[PDB]
Design a binder for this molecule. Structure first.
Ligand SMILES: [Ca+2]
Ligand SMILES: [Ca+2]
Ligand SMILES: [Ca+2]
Ligand code: NA
Length: 481
């Protein structure tokens, strides 16, 4: 059975505390369409109730304690989340929790700290003498106390910050005696620092504490895996060790995928090598190819889709996706795949043999931002493709990328899955036909377009070939009638 992941959130969902209840109500629907795992947004207390979750204030407050002016997180309470997870597990759906450990935001109080300013363009370069600043670095968790963990954070557990409260100044400050971690992205010289208070992974106590929390988090929510946030800003060797640690302590597989945001395949391959391939990464390069194809009105050379992607070289270490919360309208990395091309992009990630595909909540149900270009609900267009993956995308694959517009691939089917096998065609330009091999064992079968875009069926000839058609700027996926 093919595995399919779903990112279960988008950036602009309402702050109504009903999200965990929604996820629970959706478990039957997800199982029906072949979703086998869900990645949920950060479940711990952020800087305020409305925090999407990346501010990460208290990793041990899963919407359980009265802190930051609220008990629940934006998504609901700990009990509601546990109930949703139980519902998903009852239907054999795995749950991956988001892990935000690059920084900590929303400190309870400031501390006087001696620091120096560094060059934003080259953080290895100090551009000032020592200065006494007031930094938001004291975390004592007034509403939780010592429940679950007595660890308290201070300035010396961090490498730096971007704000001096005493002068109300936004500059990148590195604390006295600290050094940016390595290895991390070399963008801007050293990209250890991103935002809020940056965790110092050179600190022994911090290393031990984040590992301990990881195990606690997995056990408390009975997680099956993780999605790692902003890894290009976190010491690579630490991430490698953290993943191994949690797997060792829980004794579970703990599938893990990391968000290393880079357009460059080279940087992604370096990260994989440095973490000894013990976890996967999102295929960011492929997302940008989809965006480019969708915005070039047919001028994109579709043959490029087979090269320069993580999945092309590391088929078992890539999580493929079309859009996500970073790329949706209104966000800093906005690069949304245009609606007309979106079904074609989904066919590419859902019916091909390599990669672990991920469906976006925003693409299924629409995004709720305030722009005039929000993503509309496309679940009606994606559901047929999810069915194709669940029931038909099995067996040997054959690729036909011999044209700048019309490209396709087939899956011969596998005898262990009744009536499996398919032929997919997509085109970013004018429609047409392509003769493709689907396996001599399918000779004589009548296949039809499960998307409903084409009404005429195709009969497989004696030598296992079929002449398949596709409409302009569209997708057709043929399966046995
Ligand atoms: Ca450090
Ligand atoms: Ca960092
Ligand atoms: Ca083209
Ligand atoms: Na650091």
């Amino acid at each position: 059975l093919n595995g399919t992941l779903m990112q279960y959130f988008e950036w602009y969902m309402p702050n109504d505390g009903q999200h965990w209840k929604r996820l629970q109500n959706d478990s039957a629907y997800l199982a029906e369409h072949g979703i086998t795992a869900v990645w949920i947004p950060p479940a711990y207390k952020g800087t305020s109730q409305a925090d999407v979750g990346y501010g990460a204030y208290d990793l041990y407050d899963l919407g359980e304690f009265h802190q930051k002016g609220t008990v629940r997180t934006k998504y609901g309470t700990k009990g509601e989340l546990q109930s949703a997870i139980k519902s998903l597990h009852s239907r054999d759906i795995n749950v991956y929790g988001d892990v935000v450990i690059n920084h900590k935001g929303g400190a309870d109080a400031t501390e006087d700290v001696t620091a120096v300013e560094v060059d934003p363009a080259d953080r290895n370069r100090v551009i000032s003498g020592e200065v006494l600043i007031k930094a938001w670095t004291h975390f004592h968790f007034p509403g939780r106390g010592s429940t679950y963990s007595d660890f308290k954070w201070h300035w010396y557990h961090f490498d730096g910050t971007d704000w001096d409260e005493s002068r109300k100044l936004n500059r990148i400050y590195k604390f006295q005696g600290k050094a940016w971690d390595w290895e991390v992205s070399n963008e801007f010289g050293n990209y250890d620092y991103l935002m809020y208070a940056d965790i110092d992974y050179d600190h022994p106590d911090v290393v031990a504490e984040i590992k301990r929390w990881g195990t606690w988090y997995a056990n408390e929510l009975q997680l099956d895996g993780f999605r790692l946030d902003a890894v290009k800003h976190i010491k690579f060797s630490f991430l490698r060790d953290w993943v191994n640690h949690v797997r060792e302590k829980t004794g579970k597989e703990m599938f893990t995928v990391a968000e290393y945001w880079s357009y460059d395949l080279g940087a992604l391959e370096n990260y994989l090598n440095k973490t000894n391939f013990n976890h996967s990464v999102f295929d960011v390069p492929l997302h940008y190819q989809f965006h480019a194809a969708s915005t070039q009105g047919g001028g994109y050379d579709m043959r490029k889709l087979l090269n320069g992607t993580v999945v092309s070289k590391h088929p078992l270490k890539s999580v493929t996706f079309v859009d996500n919360h970073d790329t949706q309208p209104g966000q800093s990395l906005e690069s949304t795949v245009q609606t007309w091309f979106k079904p074609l992009a989904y066919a590419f990630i859902l019916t091909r043999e390599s990669g672990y595909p991920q469906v976006f909540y925003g693409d299924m149900y629409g995004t709720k931002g305030d722009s005039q270009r929000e993503i509309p609900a496309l679940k009606h267009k994606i559901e047929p493709i999810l069915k194709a993956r669940k029931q038909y995308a099995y067996g040997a694959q054959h690729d036909y990328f011999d044209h700048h517009d019309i490209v396709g691939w087939t899956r011969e089917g596998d005898s262990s899955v009744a009536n499996s096998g398919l032929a997919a065609l997509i085109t970013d330009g004018p429609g047409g036909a392509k003769r493709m091999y689907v396996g001599r064992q399918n000779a004589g079968e009548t296949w039809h377009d499960i998307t409903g875009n084409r009404s005429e069926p195709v009969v497989i000839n004696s030598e296992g070939w079929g002449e398949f058609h596709v409409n302009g700027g569209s997708v057709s996926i043929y399966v046995q009638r």
